[PDB]
């Protein structure tokens, strides 16, 4: 699907090399527009990167570092926007790509790269790279970005074949004839921002951003601001228009929300609509999230000083805080929804700052939604599961660990997960690895929880499956479909038969049983104490003391009662609470 999210890992070492590349493949296969940063790092010689073929635009910056691979096929990339920048300076950073026959990047091959709207270029310590010293970078930088830094190292360990003789000014991205830099700014007639040629009638419209196949606002190679169904525009159409006489708001039916550099009739799945017409991943100040009956969340206005919210890591007062710890565990007391993330790390426990004791973890027993991510790299040996989050229902992943993962469990050796209420990972990837004693992984129906095709479970080095089956560690037979989060009848995704509390069971106690029960939506629920259990029949029709087939003791119609109330009554012949004759 055309728009993917990016990552945010900078130069940090991926913790699971064995799955690192499937994460990139999953993010990027089919993606044309990276809503974030494109970071390609720690890739070995034999890494196939064909899934990058379709990328045209990168909203953030592009980072290519510590790779032994020889080619990154980014030939379709037209435009880097530089919304964020590597080291707050660079839109493109190519660093340390080469061995510490042979390996390392040989040619950038960015032949469609015509526009860098903000930021500059850093290229350092690439032993086998050629042609980079050839490029007229000032042509690629936007008019308002001419003073972008360019810090470029040309130290190589080999000789370069010249640019193909096809190349105009001997400026190229590679030795091939399709690798000549095409210039779109410095070679233009008049004051033209971008042209497709030397004439003044080649010249692109003022709303295009990288070039054009013509003079119109529908002929742009990229939009400088917004794409409105094929037309590049300065802004989208407002959701509201004003009555020419009275100025009452009128819903504009050509109305659109802003999403990245697009106009859209509805924000996409995990995003929030604002009254301002944006699609955001977080309400801007003094707003509250409001959830329609569609499950479709809006950022509406605060009608007063807004209620209190539980922020998690990376929000408000917890913005700069690394881990959940003893110092801040009470911050979560009584929270049902956390705006932000929760990260548990070795320092959470092995502390000045104390050790977070396992029982304090119960604060999260009331937790149903996390809007950021959940990351666990440490967890007390004495707890076999993640049941303190039994009631967690959804992780949105509007913020993801390393830009990538919405759920992450590693180095724990818990024994099962037990996140039994977890029904949705709204976005982001699930990385579960290096949990020696962890079974019940493939017992979870992962893709019932995922919401878009760029999501998957990456898992390696947990307890091996044959070792789980060889100890009878499998879903209890009452769980439907063979899907569960741990051992026993409480851990099922759905009971085949009935539910008593959290326990799946074969039969409620309608006919045989110590405390007799009725049924309600495949639940076993108690008959009132004052119902006499009936041999060979149903004992009760519901919870209330007046839904017995017959009374255990006395009756004060309509209710079976333990004793007649002292407004003075007494038991008569047939057990009925008659009133005393004198008060």
């Amino acid at each position: 699907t055309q728009v993917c999210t990016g990552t945010d890992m900078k130069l940090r070492l991926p913790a699971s090399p064995e799955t690192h590349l499937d994460m990139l493949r999953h993010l990027y296969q089919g993606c044309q527009v990276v809503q974030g940063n494109l970071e390609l790092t720690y890739l070995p010689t034999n890494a196939s990167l064909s899934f990058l073929q379709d990328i045209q635009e990168v909203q953030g910056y592009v980072l290519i570092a510590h790779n032994q691979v020889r080619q990154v096929p980014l030939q379709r990339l037209r435009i880097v926007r530089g919304t964020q920048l590597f080291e707050d300076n660079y839109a493109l950073a190519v660093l340390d790509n080469g061995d510490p026959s042979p390996g390392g990047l040989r040619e950038l091959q960015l032949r469609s790269l015509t526009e860098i709207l903000k930021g500059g270029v850093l290229i350092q310590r690439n032993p086998q790279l050629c042609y980079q010293d050839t490029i007229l970078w000032k042509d690629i930088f936007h008019k308002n970005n001419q003073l972008a830094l360019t810090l470029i190292d040309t130290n190589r360990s080999r000789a370069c074949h010249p640019c193909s003789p096809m190349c105009k000014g001997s400026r190229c991205w590679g030795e091939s004839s399709e690798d000549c830099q095409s210039l779109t700014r410095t070679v233009c007639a008049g004051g033209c921002a971008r042209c497709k040629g030397p004439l003044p009638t080649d010249c692109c419209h003022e709303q295009c951003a990288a070039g054009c196949t013509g003079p119109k606002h529908s002929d742009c190679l990229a939009c400088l601001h917004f794409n409105h169904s094929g037309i590049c525009e300065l802004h989208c159409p407002a959701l509201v228009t004003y009555n020419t006489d009275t100025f009452e708001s009128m819903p504009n039916p050509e109305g659109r929300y802003t999403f990245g550099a697009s106009c859209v009739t509805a924000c996409p799945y995990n995003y929030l609509s604002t009254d301002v017409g944006s699609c955001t991943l977080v309400c801007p100040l003094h707003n509250q999230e409001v959830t329609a009956e569609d499950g479709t969340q809006r950022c509406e206005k605060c009608s007063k000083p807004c209620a209190r919210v539980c922020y998690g890591l990376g929000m408000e007062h917890l913005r700069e805080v690394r881990a959940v710890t003893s110092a801040n565990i009470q911050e979560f007391a009584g929270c049902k929804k956390i705006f932000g993330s929760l990260a548990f790390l070795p320092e959470s426990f092995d502390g000045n700052t104390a050790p977070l004791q396992p029982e304090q973890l119960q604060v999260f027993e009331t937790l149903e939604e996390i809007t950021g991510y959940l990351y666990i790299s440490a967890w007390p040996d004495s707890l076999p599961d993640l049941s303190v989050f039994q009631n967690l229902q959804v992780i949105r992943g509007r913020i993801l660990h390393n830009g990538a993962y919405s759920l992450t469990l590693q180095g724990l050796g818990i024994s099962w997960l037990g996140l039994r209420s977890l029904r949705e990972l709204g976005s982001g990837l699930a990385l579960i690895h290096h949990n020696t004693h962890l079974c019940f992984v493939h017992t979870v129906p992962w893709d019932q929880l995922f919401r878009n095709p760029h999501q998957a479970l990456l898992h390696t080095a947990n307890r091996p499956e044959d070792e789980c089956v060889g100890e009878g560690l499998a879903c209890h037979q009452l769980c439907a479909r063979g899907h569960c989060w741990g051992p026993g009848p409480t851990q099922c995704v759905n009971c085949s038969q009935f539910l008593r509390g959290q326990e799946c069971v074969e039969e409620c106690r309608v006919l045989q049983g110590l405390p007799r029960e009725y049924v309600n939506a495949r639940h076993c629920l108690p008959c009132h104490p004052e119902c006499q259990p009936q041999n060979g029949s149903v004992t009760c029709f519901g919870p209330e003391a007046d839904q017995c087939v017959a009374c255990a003791h006395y009756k004060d119609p309509p209710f079976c009662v333990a004793r007649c109330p002292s407004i003075w009554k007494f038991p008569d012949e047939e057990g009925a609470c008659q009133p005393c004759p004198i008060n």
Partner: antibody, heavy 120, light 112 residues
Framework: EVQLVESGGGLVQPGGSLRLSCAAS????????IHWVRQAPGKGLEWVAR????????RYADSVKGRFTISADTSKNTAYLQMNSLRAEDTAVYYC?????????????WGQGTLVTVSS | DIQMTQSPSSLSASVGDRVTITCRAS??????????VAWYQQKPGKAPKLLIY???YLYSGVPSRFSGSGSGTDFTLTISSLQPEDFATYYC?????????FGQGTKVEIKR
């Protein structure tokens, strides 16, 4: 003293929805059951629903079953009746009544009634 | 369930005369409902007033000329000295079972 006051009732289209509110006063409804009885124009009294606020247990006449939900917010000392999917036959005047004390299950106190008409 | 069936459905008496509405329970869970029936008075548009509870006990504020008797599954509300105020529909109710059901109503009218 003691009373109840029905409110939030009037006019609705066929297949519509409305929320009757029954404001208790002069006693706390945790101590007893609260009833909705309705009366069509020039017809008898039809019991519609009960609730025991303490635990929220509810019972319904078969006619309204799975269309009118009755609930009770203990904090306010008030009882509600969310009608959905209003049929034409639901056109009547709606009284909320209480049962009395613990062992006294006659409808001793009643409200004033609000009219509810189902017609476009 | 239980059906309550009042009779007559309507009547017309003169001031001071004795009036007698009956109510008849219908079920196959019989026993003896007698002491678990109530009577209510309703005037056009106005909300019902409780008259009698537990079969024969007179509710406060209600004139003594109103009385109620019963035994088995057959119950009787007498009005021993009809007054012009007494124009109304009178209903019986049982709360021996749930839901508690009302009779069809007996319309009283003053022969003048």
């Amino acid at each position: 003293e003691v009373q109840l006051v029905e409110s939030g009732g009037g006019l609705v289209q066929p297949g519509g929805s409305l929320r009757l509110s029954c404001a208790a006063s002069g006693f706390n409804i945790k101590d007893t059951y609260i009833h909705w009885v309705r009366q069509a124009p020039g017809k008898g009294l039809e019991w519609v629903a009960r609730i025991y606020p303490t635990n929220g247990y509810t019972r319904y006449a078969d006619s309204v079953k799975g269309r009118f939900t009755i609930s009770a917010d203990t904090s306010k000392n008030t009882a509600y009746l969310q009608m959905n999917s209003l049929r034409a036959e639901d056109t009547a005047v709606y009284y909320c009544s209480r049962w009395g004390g613990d062992g006294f299950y006659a409808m001793d106190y009643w409200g004033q009634g609000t009219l509810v008409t189902v017609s476009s | 369930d239980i059906q309550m069936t009042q009779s007559p459905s309507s009547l017309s008496a003169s001031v001071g005369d004795r009036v007698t509405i009956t109510c008849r329970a219908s079920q196959d869970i019989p026993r003896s409902i007698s002491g678990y029936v109530a009577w209510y008075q309703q005037k056009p548009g106005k909300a019902p007033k409780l008259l009698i509870y537990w079969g024969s006990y007179l509710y406060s504020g209600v004139p003594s000329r109103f009385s109620g008797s019963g035994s088995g599954t057959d119950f009787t509300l007498t009005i021993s000295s009809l007054q012009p105020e007494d124009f109304a529909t009178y209903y019986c109710q049982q709360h021996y079972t749930t839901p508690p059901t009302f009779g069809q109503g007996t319309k009283v009218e003053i022969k003048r």
